[PDB]
Symmetry: C6
Subunit: 197 residues, 6 copies
């Protein structure tokens, strides 16, 4: 067995090197096939976690350097693979904070609200795993920001309701109602412009 495992690590290594030059996730799909083969053979769970890291920490670069959200969907399923292998909860929370930030930047520059839905499900996953409350308030305020901006750049009334649901999450978590009211006013102001269109 261990010969194949080393050869599959070599495939993952060769494919990382090639993928960074080709800028395409298909090269890393082959690498995940090899990761799942190593898992099927049986391998140290920590080595499988670090192999998964050695892909997540390359998928970000690929997703940025060729602006594309779909590359991150493959990354997200590998986060649940590290969950199932027993990566520590603090490390999951670290990784998820980090991936939320590449969604946040990519959703802005590509001008697309649908990509933010990944961020919302990741924020609820960190609510499940127990990230500190002020840090949820931060990512919800931030994602309310990118929803607000995209609702102005592209005309669609629905985008503001998602932000209002995220305001109710900050209300449910507890925050000074002065901030809540400020945010509400901004969203209803943007609605009063989209009402015209």
């Amino acid at each position: 067995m261990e010969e194949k495992i080393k050869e599959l690590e070599e495939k993952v290594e060769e494919l990382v090197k090639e993928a960074l030059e080709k800028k395409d996730p298909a090269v890393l799909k082959k690498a995940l096939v090899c990761v799942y083969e190593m898992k099927k053979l049986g391998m140290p769970n920590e080595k499988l976690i670090e192999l998964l890291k050695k892909l997540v920490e390359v998928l970000k670069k690929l997703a940025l350097e060729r602006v594309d959200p779909a590359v991150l969907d493959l990354a997200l399923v590998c986060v649940y693979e590290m969950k199932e292998l027993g990566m520590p909860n603090e490390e999951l929370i670290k990784l998820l904070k980090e991936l939320v930030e590449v969604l946040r930047i990519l959703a802005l520059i590509n001008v697309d609200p649908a990509v933010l839905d990944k961020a919302l499900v990741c924020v609820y996953l960190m609510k499940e795993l127990g990230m500190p409350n002020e840090e949820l308030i931060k990512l919800l305020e931030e994602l309310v920001e990118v929803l607000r901006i995209l609702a102005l750049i592209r005309v669609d009334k629905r985008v503001l309701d998602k932000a209002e649901v995220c305001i109710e999450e900050m209300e449910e978590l507890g925050m000074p109602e002065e901030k809540i009211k400020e945010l509400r006013e901004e969203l209803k102001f943007v609605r009063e412009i989209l009402d015209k269109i």
Copy 2:
């Protein structure tokens, strides 16, 4: 007769050797046409079964080494051809276990729930052919898992209802009610997340 049969075997052989380098099921389609011609020519039923194994096995490799679902549809047909030629029930249950265990990995890595329906069809086929109750529950737990994951990776409420249906098949198959309620609570949690959207 026998010369055409041998020349059709030689065609299957060379088409297989081409297909693995070419990476396309279009090559294997002509090989399967030639398998049907050898059926019409009355080649021995066991030889057809073995040639069909020596296409199912190549379809698995092709489907993995360039990821899409469609290649497997030929394998699903060829399983019923082996049923009809009289391959033993134990060998059908073997290949159906094995092929479900390629649907599962490809559904994850390509991020698509639609392929999972074929796995459910194959589960009910192994129910028809008499797989043991625990082993049916095992694939139903697994496919409930890949449904749960794709219901988180993309927003669509319907995916969880198919999972709920499959939990009720494990209930029909006598799974412990404590495990049923654990699984249910997870799916209702994912529905409460999708209710936001």
Copy 3:
């Protein structure tokens, strides 16, 4: 006159030789135009029937060596041309029995139920022309087989209703009710699986 007739036979045979190498029906479409021109010139009706055979018996080979079913639509039209020219009803039934077989192999290998409707139309045309009942039972049984298999590969409830209609044709031919009940049981079993989906 006869110079144009020979030149059209030359066009037909040289385009046949070309088409087999190029693998496309568009080469034969020009030959079929040249066949209609030979009809317009009053070429003997038997010579025209034989020229139509010399296309039908090449259309099937093209339609196997590449898998697309649209090539057969010319064959179907040319069967009615031989009907109009007065080819014997027994020989129509022979050509139709032959053509119905290529429809089966493309339905299966292309994994597509929509082509089978053409087989149902041809079964009813042999009902019109007077095939012996037990041979309709064969084709009807076998076609409900391909319908049953594609209802498992491709998930759509409607396919089984065509199969029920074709069981009612076997019941209209008076086939023993033991077979009807077996076929029905297998179909409501497949419906009960598709009811899940």
Copy 4:
């Protein structure tokens, strides 16, 4: 003036020779643009009629030698241009018989019922201009045949209703009622088949 007129005739000639080698109506669209300039320059109306004839009698060759219907739409336009220029009624009736007599063979070989509507329009145009009554009935019987054949090759009930309306034109034009009942029986037979589908 006459220099431009002759250079436009030369353009028509050069474009006709080019079109027949290139096999594309866009070369002839250019020639018709030039004919419309020659028409605005007020050259002899009979020369314009013969120039339009020398495009109609090349559009048909193009439309056969590669099969698509849209080439004929130019021809049908130029028929009304020749009507307006005052071409004798028997030439219109002759050319329109000829175009009906290309719509048939192209509608058959492309297996497309939708083109036949242009034929029915040209039938009613020859009803306006007058034709010997049995010749309308011949073209209506023929088009009722291509409608019947395409109602078998394409599964769609609607095609038989157009044919029924056309039978009622043969009824209005007074072919004997036994022949009408033969046509009707054949069409309700095809409807009883398409009722299954």
Copy 5:
């Protein structure tokens, strides 16, 4: 500043000479951008009207020498630009007569009614700018002609109602009622044929 002004005239010249040989309007879009820059630089209004004439009198020639309608949309815009800069009403009416004629020819040679709406808009614009009722009637009779022809060639009931509205404009402009009755009879004859569809 005058250096940029003459350089923008030279850019118009260069891009015109390129466009007219290359045959694509995208080259003239840049020349118009340079015209709008010269307007912003306060180039004299009559020079700008002549520069605009020196593009309209090339858009038409491009739009004939390869046949598509969209090239004329620029010209329709630039006419209102010339209106704003103070082109004489007689120059507008002349030029709009000229452009309406290229819509009329292009609507025949390419089998499409949708372009004729732009001609109807220009008719109402010359109604606003004060063309005589008799000349409006001339264009309305012509556009009723091309509507009638396309209604027959490429069957759709709806096209004919626009022509009825345009007959009511000739009635409003004042036309001898026997002519209105002739046109109505021809148009209802065309509807009675479009009932056979």
Copy 6:
């Protein structure tokens, strides 16, 4: 830190230099990624505002020299980046006047009503930032003009309703009614033309 900041400034400016020659926004998207990296590295706010200016003042020239509107969407995002980053309100009003003054040309030369919505939201942003009444009213008259022109160049009722809403913004913001009544009469004339269609 400062080495990465200088390298990111160099990576911006060298992509900008080639973006102008290549003529595509995908080059500048990578430069804007590197701008967000320089904010992440804490480069001083006034240098980041300068870089955002340097980028916007190249986005416009690209969006003119190739005529498509989507390039401006980045510019709108970077304007809100400068808002948040703390560029003074009067020079936001300057940049927003300047950017509206490319939409107003690009909407005409590549005929499209839909882009004007991006201008209307920027007008209401300059309302929020407090540009003077008569300067908004000028842009609203101008955009009511481009809405008027496109409502004539292509048929759609809705374009006039946006313009009516915008005229009522001028009534709210304060302008005498003779302008309102003139504008209304013109828009009602365009509705009366579109009522024909």
